[PDB]
């Protein structure tokens, strides 16, 4: 679920999902168009594609369980949708952590008109 993803993001990065990734660049927190602005935005592009691989799942609301082995995220077995949603969220959280070094506040609340064109998953 979105709320679980937000907690995972905070655990991973130290940043609150809202507002740190809820409106960042062209793909975080909302969009579906344009060239991603930077690595962090690319995390969101890929995460959007990942959810797009799951038509019949409901990532906003469906809850999954996971644990941390040491620092590693281990998705625990639920329904097939839950497992796949968890893997998408895990990847995004890791991706945000891997990019923190180039995260830029200038991309928070990035305006939609600066995001144009289709980028295929």
């Amino acid at each position: 679920s979105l709320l679980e993803f937000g907690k995972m993001i905070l655990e991973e990065t130290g940043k609150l999902a809202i507002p740190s990734y809820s409106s960042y660049g062209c793909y975080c927190g909302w969009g579906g168009s344009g060239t991603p602005k930077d690595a962090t935005d690319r995390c969101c592009f890929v995460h959007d594609c990942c959810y797009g691989n799951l038509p019949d799942c409901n990532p906003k609301s469906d809850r999954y369980k996971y644990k941390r082995v040491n620092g590693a995220i281990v998705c625990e077995k639920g329904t097939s949708c839950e497992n796949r949603i968890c893997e998408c969220d895990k990847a995004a959280a890791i991706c945000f952590r891997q990019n923190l070094n180039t995260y830029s506040k200038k991309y928070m609340l990035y305006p939609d008109f600066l995001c144009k064109g289709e980028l295929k998953c």
């Binding site: 979105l2 937000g6 999902a17 809202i18 809820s22 975080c28 927190g29 909302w30």
Partner: peptide
Amino acid sequence: FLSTK
């Protein structure tokens, strides 16, 4: 309490 598309 919502936040991410």
